């Protein structure tokens, strides 16, 4: 560790703790910078030499975290919990938490190499047909989205899960043991306990379950309606009206968003076509247009534009040269208050437009809290950060807004059009809920030891069937590691944040619409050009993690807890309509033939 980056001396009392805290933050910026920079170089240009530089950069950050971590515990361990300043207790609480830096050197290197290898495996895996091979993004993504051929979709689903999942498994086991070993020395029973403590709610798991119970009837009804629509296209052989849906027929590799099958489920096809992708293609929209249009929504609210550094630095398309990259969208803060970037392999579609807004939301957060102490540059909780861009995307997807931006010529205000719109949004928002809830339930069980390696896939599919009511379209066994085929698992980044954001964003939407002075139905609200709504959103963004998230929420929304009510209110019309339709069609809500799997196509796997 470079001498400048090492800690000096401070008094062993609260007043000393304040100075320790101030100096820690000054040094940390450079170490965060070189780390993030080394990660960028690798993720935008995957090579062994860049991977090695990233591993070296991570080692340095562990050195840093060790020096300052041990210093905080040297001075403050028996006394920091009774400190009078609660904002101090949060940083000294953090700095005394070493994480992987608790590992001896050889295991640090093993830990860093594992993250590097798992990430490379997920992002360079391919499905080969003969000579040629498909990558996840764009090739397999476009197949899952626009093929309606049962066999083709199955070849893509099976291919990807095998390519990514199988080689990840032995590495994921080693990672889990090293991860737990590290956080066990910080006082947590396991890494999962550490991840949960970010929400600082002693009753987090029960609060989540009580939320899910309110939402589950909305999913069951969406599920049944959709299952019926599929049965009409695929037939009685491949779809069971009383069983789970095959996991490859919902438009998405993880069946996590159902937006791509909108055309099969749209109840009133004679109204305006709310999927706007084909108009985007016809008009010749490119990535740059999508980002500029996103930016302009932000600036309409009197929030910040993207700085020159973002446009010069960002990667907005998959590289055309001979270069491999991590294609999973991501937003980047370099912790120097100047450099902020998005890395997205942007495709020209309506959902990608929402994703552009999603990522730009992360950046806008960075732009607003950049003058705060580096430790306070986070969301109020991780769910806040994930909700910002989605909030705006709610206004952007409205037919009234799509008209303003030239993507929809008709603009009708009738109950059939509302049901079309609300159903489309449910395919994106309601269909995600079960998946968003289950990923970290799986991962928490793995970290606790409840799910050992011999049950990784057993317990994944139990949860997948339990919550989503889907089944794998081919037989799986414990050699498969289907969880590993989802980005966030091998990239070791938590998921519960997405479930929290899909609820929170409707709470934000309701409050910003009210502040904008908007009076009609909540699902028709567009906050475009509302400076008042902007000022309110800005207060949350500039606060960072300096105050408890319960208080930040209260000031914005009037409530100090997560609440499903605004989401229910938003969807109320289609919730009532879907119930009615399923009764009238004699549907069964749920999948009581839980053991059912579809047969293989006759010529599997040829074509
Ligand atoms: C789409 O249409 C709805 C419904 O509009 C209402 O019913 C229709 C059948 C017609 O008869 C309309 O003339 C009638 O307004 C619109 O929602 C409605 O918007 C109005 C005005 O924004 C709301 O009236 C307000 O009510 C509040 C009290 O909550 C008062 O403070 C205000 O003074 C104001 O009068 C009305 O509540 C609202 N209706 C419902 C059921 O929520 C909607 O605006 C329209 N959408 C678009 C994009 O034009
Ligand atoms: C499209 C979005 C990408 P994201 O912006 O949340 C992406 C996911 C990710 C996480 C770690 C490494 C690399 C990427 N998150 C980010 O880029 C940011 N670092 C999130 C952030 N949080 N605080 N500051 N920044 C995402 O993954 N969405 C969920 C719903 C999904 N598609 O499963
Ligand atoms: C991808 O990364 C490699 C390093 O892994 C970069 O290659 C270096 O480029 C510089 C300047 O052009 C040379 O001086 C080095 O000798 C190169 N290293 C190697 C191992 O070849 C490369 O520039 C990166 N590509 C892009 C587009 O950024
Ligand atoms: C797990 O399954 C592996 C491959 O899958 C099998 O073959 C495919 C083509 C399907 O038809 C399906 O029935 C089978 O699952 C096997 O090679 C492997 O032996 C299995 N693993 C164990 C431990 O038995
Ligand atoms: Cl999280
Ligand atoms: Zn995100």
Coordinates of N, CA and C and ligand atoms in Angstrom, one line a residue, residues 41 44-51 53 321 323, ligand 3:
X41 N -12.0 -1.2 -18.1 CA -11.1 -1.7 -19.2 C -11.3 -3.1 -19.5
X44 N -15.3 -3.7 -21.1 CA -15.4 -3.2 -22.4 C -14.4 -3.8 -23.4
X45 N -13.6 -4.8 -23.0 CA -12.5 -5.4 -23.8 C -12.0 -6.6 -23.0
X46 N -12.7 -7.7 -23.1 CA -12.4 -8.8 -22.3 C -11.1 -9.5 -22.8
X47 N -10.0 -9.4 -22.1 CA -8.8 -10.1 -22.4 C -8.1 -10.6 -21.1
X48 N -7.2 -11.5 -21.2 CA -6.5 -12.1 -20.0 C -5.7 -11.0 -19.4
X49 N -5.1 -10.1 -20.1 CA -4.2 -9.1 -19.6 C -5.0 -8.1 -18.8
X50 N -6.2 -7.7 -19.4 CA -7.1 -6.8 -18.6 C -7.7 -7.5 -17.4
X51 N -8.0 -8.8 -17.4 CA -8.4 -9.5 -16.3 C -7.4 -9.5 -15.1
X53 N -5.0 -7.2 -14.6 CA -4.9 -5.8 -14.1 C -6.1 -5.6 -13.1
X321 N -15.8 -4.0 -33.9 CA -14.5 -4.5 -34.1 C -14.4 -5.9 -33.6
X323 N -13.7 -7.7 -30.8 CA -13.6 -7.4 -29.4 C -14.8 -8.0 -28.6
Ligands
LIG3 C1 -7.9 -4.3 -25.4 O1 -6.9 -4.5 -24.4 C2 -5.6 -4.7 -24.8 C3 -4.8 -5.1 -23.6 O2 -5.3 -6.3 -23.1 C4 -5.1 -3.4 -25.5 O3 -3.9 -3.8 -26.2 C5 -2.8 -2.8 -25.9 O4 -2.8 -1.7 -26.7 C6 -1.7 -0.8 -26.5 C7 -1.9 0.5 -27.4 O5 -2.6 0.3 -28.5 C8 -0.4 -1.5 -26.8 O6 0.8 -0.7 -26.5 C9 -0.3 -2.8 -25.9 O7 0.9 -3.5 -26.3 C10 -1.5 -3.6 -26.2 N1 -1.4 -4.8 -25.4 C11 -1.5 -6.1 -25.9 C12 -1.4 -7.2 -25.0 O8 -1.7 -6.3 -27.1 C13 -6.1 -2.9 -26.6 O9 -5.7 -1.6 -27.0 C14 -7.5 -3.0 -26.1 N2 -8.4 -2.6 -27.2 C15 -9.2 -1.6 -27.1 C16 -10.1 -1.3 -28.3 O10 -9.2 -0.7 -26.2

